[PDB]
C-alpha cells in the first residue's frame, strides 16, 4: 500500500472540510497534506490551478511540490497525471508529472558526511509516457550531478573517464583523445587554453547510431574556469557538455531513428607561469587566426576548432551548447537561455522543443553590424572586443567556424545552468542539467521529419 | 549646373581609367572623384556593391557618402536611385537616397562659434517617394536636434514650449500642463521625480486629427538625467519624446488616414534636498503603488501614470518609446533597440516597420517568471530588483499600467538613441533620431490596415 | 640616411607588435643574435648557469614565476675616443606577477635599444656603442617572486 497519495485538484474542485480549514484553493503546486479516508496513510491535495490555464509545466510542477511533500513516508502514488478537464493530453500530463516527480526529489549528498522513500508510483494508462518523462529526467540528473561534482573530483581526465564509462553502458561508440593523439586533431584552441593547468585537457566523441539524418552536438566542458590570467570580474563552466553527454545517454532508451556525434573538449582554465597570454595569437584547424584579448573569453576559443572538425566535409546540422557568456543574463535573466541560428526553421524547430520540455529561451539576431567587434589589429578576429555585446559577438565568433552550407545552431545557456538562488517548482538550487531535455526534445523532433 | 554629379554603380559597372587607377571597385558607400568629361565640373563614382545583395539601406548609405564627399560644391545632384539591375524597386531606391542625403548632411553646429552647397537634388521620376523620405530624414533631424541639444537650453519648461511652437507649424492639438493644472492631471510619478530639480516638470499632450484607428505614442522625456541620489553606475534620455514628437510632426504632409496621439511626461532627475528618496512610494494614478529602491530607474516611475491615463476608457493601441535601461545594451550591442509586446501582429508590424526604415531591434520576451523580480515588501511592485534581467522587468513593470484589453508595445532605445562611438553610414555622433522613421513606418502600415 | 632610421624604426614596430608567444625571451634573444650577424655586431647570449654566473639578481628573480627562462644578451657596435652604453628593458610579456596590474610591449626599450644598434653600421660612426638587454617574462606561479621578497644585488645593495 501507498504510504502517501498525492491528488491533483483544479480550481473549483471537491477537498474535505479540514483540506478547506487549512486554506487549500487549489494553487499550483499548493500541498495540503490530510489522513486518508480510513485513518491508516495520507492523502496529499495538491493544486493545479484553473483547469482552463492549465499546462504540461503546471503538472511538472505539482509532481515537484508532490515528492518535497511526502515527510518520512516508503511509498508515494502520484494520482496527479489523472485529472483531467484542462487542454493537457493524458500522456503529456503523464510525461510531466514522472519528469516533475524525478526531477523534485533530486539531491546530491555525496560530500556530505554522515531518504526512506522507496518507491514512487504514478498512476496513469500512459505508461510509454511514464517511461519518457522518467528517462528524461533521469538524464536532466545525470548532466545536474557532473555540474555539482567539484571540479578536483571532475577533472578532464576523470571526466573523459566517466563518459567512456557512460558510453559502455549503451555501447554508444567513444573515443577518448589525449597526450599526442590529441595534438594529432589540430584543435589548438583547446590545447593553447587548457595549457596552465596541472590537469591536461581531453577531446571525446561520443556517438549514437542505431537514418538518413546526422546530428553533431558540441558541448564545452571547461571544468574549471578561474578566468585564467585576466581574471573573471567556476566549476558549472562545463554545463553545455554535461547536457550534450546526459542527452546522448538518453537516447539508447527512446530509440531515435537518428544519428547523433557528441563532439566534447575539456579543459580547465588556470593561472600558471605556462598559462595562455593575453596578445597571444591561437592558429585554428581552418587556418585562421584568434587573438587573445581577454583569457576569460576562453569558450569561444576552445570551441573554435571542434565546430571546424565537426562540420568539415558529414553531419546535416550541427548544435552547440554551452555556457559562453555572462553578458546574456544582463538583460534576459537568471532563468532564460539564448538561441542563435540563421536557419528560421531550425529556429522553430528548438524553440517549439523547449517549450514542450518546459525551459525557457530567447532567440537573438546574429546581427551583422556586431561583426566589426570582432576586429583585430593583428589576427583574424579577437576572442573579446571590450565592447557591449558579447553575447552576440560571440555567436558570431562561432559561426565564421561552421562549415558553408551547414544548418547550426548555438545554445548559450551561462545562467539558467546554475542556479545560485533558491530551489523552485522542479529545479534544485546548483547545478539544473539546463537544456538536457530541450535537446531530447529536439532531436525526437527533427527524427521525425 | 550641378558642381557635383554622384553615380550609382554596382559591382562590374563601368568607370573610366582614372577612376580604376585610383582603386574604384564598387565597394558599398566606397567613393572616387574625378573631373567630368568636359573638364567644368565632379563626378563622383559611388559603390552599391553586387547587384544581386544590394538593399534599400545600401541606398541610404550610399547617398550619405556621397554628400560627405562633396567638398565646397555649392550643388550636388545624386543619380543613384537610377542604378537599376537590383532587387530594390525604383520608389524605394529614391525614397533611401532622399533619406540619406538628408541624414548624412546634418550637422549640429549651434553652439560652435565662428556650408558652400546650396543645393542637393536627387534624379528619379518617383517624385512622391523622394517627398516622403525628405520628409521622414527631417524628422529624424529634428529628433537629433532635440537631443544634442543641451540640458541647460532644452529643460521641461523649454521643451514643452519647443512642442507648442511645432505643433502650431500644422494646427496639431497641443496642451502643455504646468504647476496647478499639471497636479490634476494625477501623474504621480512625474511630480515625485521631477521635484529635486530646480526646473518644473510639464506633460504635453499633442494630437494627430486630420479615421476608425487611434494610435497612443507615449515618450519618455527626462531632459536631464543625473540618477539622482542613488547616482548612475546625461542629457539624451529624452530621446523617446524626441522621437514621438519628431513622429507627430511628419503625420500631416504624409496625409495618414489616422488618429494619433502624443503623451510626453517631461522632467529632470537631479540630486537636491527635496529630492525622491530611496525608500519613498508613489501612489499611482490606478491607485497601485512603488516603492523607488533605486532613485536612477526614475523612467519607468514617470511612464506608469501616463499609460494609465493614456490607455484609459479610446485609444485602441499604446505604444510607448523611451531610453530606459542599461541593461538592454550588454548582450544587444549598441545599436539596436529593444521591442516588446504582447501581440504577436503587433510585434510583426513594428518589426517589418524597422527594416523598411533601416532601424535595428530585438523583440525579447513578456518573461512570466521575472515578475518575480517586481515584488516589493511595503508596495505593490518596486523599481528595481538589483537582480540581473532589469530590460525585461522594465517591460514587465510598464505592462501593468496598461488597461486591459490595450494592445501594447514597448521601444527600449537606450542604447542606439546616442552614437558615442564614430559616425557611420547616415548615422552622425551624438544624438540619432533612432525609431522616428520606425514609427512613422508603423503608423504608414497600421492606417492602411 | 632616412630609409636607415626608418627601417630599423619598423623593425622595433615588428617586435612591439610580435605576440608574447612568439617573442619569448629565449626567442627574442635568437632574434638579436641573427640581427647582430648581419653586420657582425660583436653578440652574446647568456643563458642557465652561464646567466646565473653575472649575478644580474633582480633579472633571475623577476623572471623566475614564468615556464619562459630568462634570458641577458650584449649587443657591440665597434666600428673611437668615446664608448656609449644602452641598456633596454625586455620584459616580453607583464602580466603584473602576483600583485597584479590595476602586456606583450613592455620589452619596447629593448627593441628600441636593438634597432637603433642594427642601423649604426650603416650610419658608419666613429662611435663604440654598446647595447645591454635583460629579458623576461612576469608571470604569476606557485614559484612566482613574493611580495615581502628582498633582493640582494649586484653591488650588495638590497
Ligand atoms: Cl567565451
Ligand atoms: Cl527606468
Tied chains: 1, 2.
Excluded at 70 to 89: E, I, K, N, Q
Aim: hydrophobic share 45%; net charge neutral; with cysteine.
Amino acid at each position: 500500500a501507498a504510504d502517501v497519495v498525492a491528488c491533483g485538484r483544479h480550481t473549483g474542485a471537491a477537498v474535505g472540510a479540514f483540506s478547506r480549514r487549512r486554506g487549500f484553493v487549489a494553487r499550483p503546486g499548493q500541498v495540503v497534506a490530510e489522513p486518508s479516508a480510513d485513518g491508516r496513510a495520507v492523502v496529499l491535495n495538491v493544486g493545479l490551478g484553473p483547469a482552463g490555464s492549465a499546462t504540461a509545466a503546471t503538472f511538472r510542477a505539482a509532481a515537484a511540490a508532490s515528492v518535497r511533500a511526502v515527510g518520512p513516508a516508503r511509498t508515494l502514488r502520484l494520482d496527479l497525471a489523472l485529472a483531467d478537464g484542462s487542454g493537457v493530453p493524458a500522456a503529456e500530463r503523464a510525461r510531466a508529472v514522472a519528469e516533475g516527480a524525478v526531477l523534485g526529489l533530486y539531491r546530491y549528498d555525496e560530500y556530505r558526511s554522515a531518504s526512506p522513500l522507496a518507491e514512487v508510483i504514478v498512476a496513469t494508462p500512459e505508461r510509454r509516457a511514464v517511461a519518457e518523462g522518467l528517462a528524461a529526467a533521469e538524464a536532466t540528473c545525470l548532466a545536474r550531478d557532473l555540474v555539482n561534482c567539484p571540479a578536483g573530483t571532475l577533472t578532464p581526465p576523470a571526466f573523459a573517464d566517466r563518459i567512456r564509462e557512460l558510453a559502455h553502458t549503451a555501447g554508444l561508440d567513444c573515443a577518448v583523445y589525449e597526450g599526442a593523439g590529441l595534438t594529432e586533431l589540430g584543435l589548438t584552441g583547446l590545447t593553447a587554453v587548457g595549457r596552465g593547468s596541472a590537469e591536461p585537457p581531453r577531446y571525446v566523441e561520443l556517438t549514437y547510431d542505431p537514418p538518413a539524418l546526422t546530428v553533431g552536438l558540441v558541448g564545452k566542458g571547461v571544468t574549471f574556469d578561474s578566468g585564467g590570467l585576466s581574471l573573471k570580474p567556476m566549476k558549472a563552466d562545463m554545463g553545455g557538455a554535461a547536457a550534450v553527454v546526459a542527452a546522448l545517454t538518453a537516447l539508447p532508451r527512446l530509440g531515435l531513428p537518428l544519428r547523433v556525434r557528441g563532439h566534447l573538449p575539456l579543459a580547465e582554465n588556470m593561472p600558471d607561469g605556462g598559462a595562455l597570454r593575453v596578445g597571444d595569437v591561437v592558429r585554428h584547424l581552418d587556418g585562421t587566426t584568434t587573438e587573445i584579448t581577454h583569457t576569460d573569453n576562453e569558450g569561444r576559443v576552445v570551441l573554435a576548432d571542434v565546430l571546424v572538425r565537426a562540420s568539415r566535409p558529414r553531419s546535416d546540422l550541427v548544435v552547440d551548447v554551452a555556457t559562453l557568456t555572462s553578458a546574456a543574463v544582463h538583460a534576459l535573466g537568471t532563468r532564460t537561455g539564448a538561441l542563435f541560428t540563421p536557419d528560421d526553421r531550425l529556429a522553430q524547430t528548438v524553440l517549439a522543443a523547449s517549450e514542450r520540455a518546459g525551459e525557457s529561451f530567447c532567440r537573438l539576431p546574429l546581427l551583422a553590424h556586431e561583426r566589426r567587434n570582432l576586429r583585430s589589429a593583428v589576427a583574424d578576429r579577437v576572442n573579446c572586443s571590450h565592447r557591449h555585446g558579447d553575447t552576440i559577438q560571440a555567436a558570431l565568433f562561432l559561426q565564421d567556424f561552421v562549415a558553408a552550407g551547414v544548418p547550426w545552431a548555438h545554445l548559450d545557456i551561462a545562467a539558467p545552468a546554475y542556479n545560485d538562488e533558491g530551489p523552485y517548482a522542479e529545479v534544485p538550487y546548483g547545478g539544473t542539467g539546463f537544456a538536457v531535455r530541450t535537446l531530447i526534445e529536439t532531436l525526437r523532433a527533427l527524427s521525425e521529419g
